Amino acid sequence: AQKFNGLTVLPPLLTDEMIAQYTSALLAGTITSGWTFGAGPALQ
Amino acid sequence: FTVEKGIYQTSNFRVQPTESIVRFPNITNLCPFGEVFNATRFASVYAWNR
Amino acid sequence: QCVNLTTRTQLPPAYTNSFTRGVYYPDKVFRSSVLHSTQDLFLPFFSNVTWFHAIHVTKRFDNPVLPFNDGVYFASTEKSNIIRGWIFGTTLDSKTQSLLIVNNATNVVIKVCEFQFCNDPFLGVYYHKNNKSWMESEFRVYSSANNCTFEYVSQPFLMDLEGKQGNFKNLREFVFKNIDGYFKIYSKHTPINLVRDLPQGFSALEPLVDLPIGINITRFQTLLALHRSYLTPGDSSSGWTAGAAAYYVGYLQPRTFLLKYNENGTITDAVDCALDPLSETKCTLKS
Amino acid sequence: RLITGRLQSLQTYVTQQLIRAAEIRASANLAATKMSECVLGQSKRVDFC
Amino acid sequence: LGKLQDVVNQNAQALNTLVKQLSSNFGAISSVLNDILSRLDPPEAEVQIDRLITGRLQSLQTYVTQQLIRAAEIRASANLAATKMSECVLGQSKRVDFC
Amino acid sequence: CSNLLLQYGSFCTQLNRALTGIAVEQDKNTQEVFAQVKQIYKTPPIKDFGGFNFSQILPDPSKPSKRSPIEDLLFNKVT
Amino acid sequence: LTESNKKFLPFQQFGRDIADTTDAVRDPQTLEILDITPCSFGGVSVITPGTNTSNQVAVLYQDVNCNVFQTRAGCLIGAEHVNNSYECDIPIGAGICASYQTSQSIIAYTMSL
Amino acid sequence: LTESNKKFLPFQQFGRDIADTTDAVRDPQTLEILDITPCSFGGVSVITPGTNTSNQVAVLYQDVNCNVFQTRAGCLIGAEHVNNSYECDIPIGAGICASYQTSQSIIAYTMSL
Ligand SMILES: *[C@@H]1O[C@H](CO)[C@@H](O[C@@H]2O[C@H](CO)[C@@H](O)[C@H](O)[C@H]2NC(C)=O)[C@H](O)[C@H]1NC(C)=O
Ligand SMILES: *[C@@H]1O[C@H](CO)[C@@H](O)[C@H](O)[C@H]1NC(C)=O
Ligand SMILES: *[C@@H]1O[C@H](CO)[C@@H](O)[C@H](O)[C@H]1NC(C)=O
Ligand SMILES: *[C@@H]1O[C@H](CO)[C@@H](O)[C@H](O)[C@H]1NC(C)=O
Ligand SMILES: *[C@@H]1O[C@H](CO)[C@@H](O)[C@H](O)[C@H]1NC(C)=O
Ligand SMILES: *[C@@H]1O[C@H](CO)[C@@H](O)[C@H](O)[C@H]1NC(C)=O
Ligand SMILES: *[C@@H]1O[C@H](CO)[C@@H](O)[C@H](O)[C@H]1NC(C)=O
Ligand SMILES: *[C@@H]1O[C@H](CO)[C@@H](O)[C@H](O)[C@H]1NC(C)=O
Ligand SMILES: *[C@@H]1O[C@H](CO)[C@@H](O)[C@H](O)[C@H]1NC(C)=O
Ligand SMILES: *[C@@H]1O[C@H](CO)[C@@H](O)[C@H](O)[C@H]1NC(C)=O
Ligand SMILES: *[C@@H]1O[C@H](CO)[C@@H](O)[C@H](O)[C@H]1NC(C)=O
Ligand SMILES: *[C@@H]1O[C@H](CO)[C@@H](O)[C@H](O)[C@H]1NC(C)=O
Ligand SMILES: *[C@@H]1O[C@H](CO)[C@@H](O)[C@H](O)[C@H]1NC(C)=O
Which of residues 78 through 117 in chain C touch H, CB cutoff 8 A? none
Min Cα separation E10/chain H (Å): 15
The sign of the torsion formed by the CA atoms of G55, G60, G66, G70 equals positive
Distance of alpha carbon B37 from alpha carbon B42, whole angstroms: 8
Ligand nearest to the CA of H83: 13
Round to whole Å and give the CA distance between A9 and A30.
Answer: 35
Closest residue to atom 1 of ligand 4, CA basis: C104
SS3 (DSSP) at E78: helix
Buried b (16+ CB within 10 A) or exposed e, F22-42: beeeeeebeebbeeeeeeeee
Shortest Cα distance from A20 to chain G (angstroms)? 11
Burial of C200 (0-12, 13-18, 19+ CB in 10 A): exposed
Rounded-to-integer distance, Cα E62 and Cα E56, Å? 10
Contact C240, C8 (CB under 8 A): no
Q: How far apart are CA E92 and CA C3, in angstroms?
A: 102
Residue A27: φ, ψ to 5° = -65, -45
Exposed/middle/buried for C257, CB within 10 Å: 0-12, 13-18, 19+?
buried
Q: What's the CA gap between C1 and C138, in Å, rounded?
A: 10
Instruction: Kindly tell me the sign of the dihedral angle through the C-alpha atoms of C206, C211, C217, C223.
Output: negative
CA of H83 to the centre of ligand 13 (A): 6
* Cα–Cα distances in angstroms (integers) from residue F1 to residues E28, E39, E57, F6, in the given order: 15, 16, 13, 10
Q: Is G113 on the interface with A (CB under 8 A)?
A: yes
Residues of A in contact with G17 (CB under 8 A): 1
* Binding-site residues on chain H for chain E (CB distance < 8 A): 19-21
| Element at F74 (helix H, strand E) | helix F69-77
Strand partners, C222: C86
The number of CA neighbours under 13 Å toward the Cβ of C170 is 12
Smallest CA–CA distance, residue C247 to chain G, in Å, is: 32
The response to whether residue C30 sits with its C-beta less than 6 Å from ligand 3 reads: no
Q: How far apart are the C-alpha atoms of H112 and H107, rounded to whole Å? A: 14
**Coil vs helix vs strand at D48:** coil
**Distance (Å, rounded) from C-alpha F5 to C-alpha E53?**
8
Chains in touch with H (3+ beta-carbon pairs under 8 Å) read B, C, E, F
Q: Are C39 and C69 in contact (CB under 8 A)?
A: no
Task: Give dist(CA E68, CA E70) in Å, integer.
Answer: 5
Residue G55 Cβ contacting ligand 10 at under 6 Å: no
CA distance E3 to E11: 13
Task: Give H28's contacts (C-beta < 8 A, 6+ positions apart).
Answer: B24, B25, B26, H13
DSSP 8-state symbol, G35:
E
State the DSSP H helix or E strand holding residue G70, giving kind and residue range, or none if neither. Answer: strand G68-71
With a CB cutoff of 8 Å and minimum separation 6, the contacts of G4 are G24, G33, G34, G35
Is the alpha carbon torsion for H82, H84, H85, H89 positive or negative? negative
Counting Cα atoms < 13 Å in the Cβ hemisphere of H61 gives 17
User: In chain G, positions 17-76, which contact chain A (CB-CB < 8 Å)?
Assistant: 17, 19, 21, 23, 37-38, 40-42, 62-63, 72-73
Q: Strands C134-140 and C122-127, how do they pair?
A: antiparallel
Q: Are C116 and C152 in contact (CB under 8 A)?
A: no
Within 10 angstroms of residue D40's Cβ, the number of other Cβ atoms is: 19
Nearest CB among H16, H18, H20 relative to C30 is that of H16
Q: Is-contact E8 F79, C-beta < 8 A?
A: yes
For residue F73, CA distances in Å to F54, F67, F77 come to: 16, 9, 6
Shortest Cα distance, chain E CAs vs residue F29, angstroms: 6
Q: Name the neighbours of F, counting chains with at least 3 Cβ pairs within 8 A.
A: E, H
Give, in degrees to the nearest 5, the angle at Cα C184 between C179 and C185.
160
Which residues make beta-bridge pairs with H27? H32
Distance CA C103, CA C154 (A): 11
The edge-to-edge listing of strands for the beta sheet with C170-179 is C14-17, C48-53, C246-251, C72-76, C170-179, C182-191, C206-212
3-state secondary structure of B34: helix
Closest of H25, E94, H97 to residue C30, by C-alpha: H25
Residue type, C171: L
DSSP state of F17: H
User: In what side-by-side order are the strands of the sheet with G68-71?
Assistant: G44-47, G58-61, G74-77, G68-71
Least Cα distance to E75 among C214, B31, C258, F32 occurs for F32
Task: Give dist(CA C110, CA C126) in Å, integer.
Answer: 24
Q: Which residues of chain E have a CB within 8 Å of the CB of A39?
A: 96-97
Angle at E57 between CA H60 and CA E69, to 5 degrees: 75
User: Exposure of G87 by Cβ count < 10 A (0-12 exposed, 13-18 middle, 19+ buried)?
Assistant: exposed
How far apart CA H24 and CA C31 sit, in angstroms, is 10
Give buried/exposed letters for C103-131 (b at 16+ CB in 10 A, else e): bebeebebbbbbbbbbebbbbbbebeeee
| Distance in Å, CA E87 to ligand 11 centroid | 74
Q: For residues H100 and H53, is the Cβ–Cβ distance under 8 A?
A: yes
Helices (H), chain D: 2-34
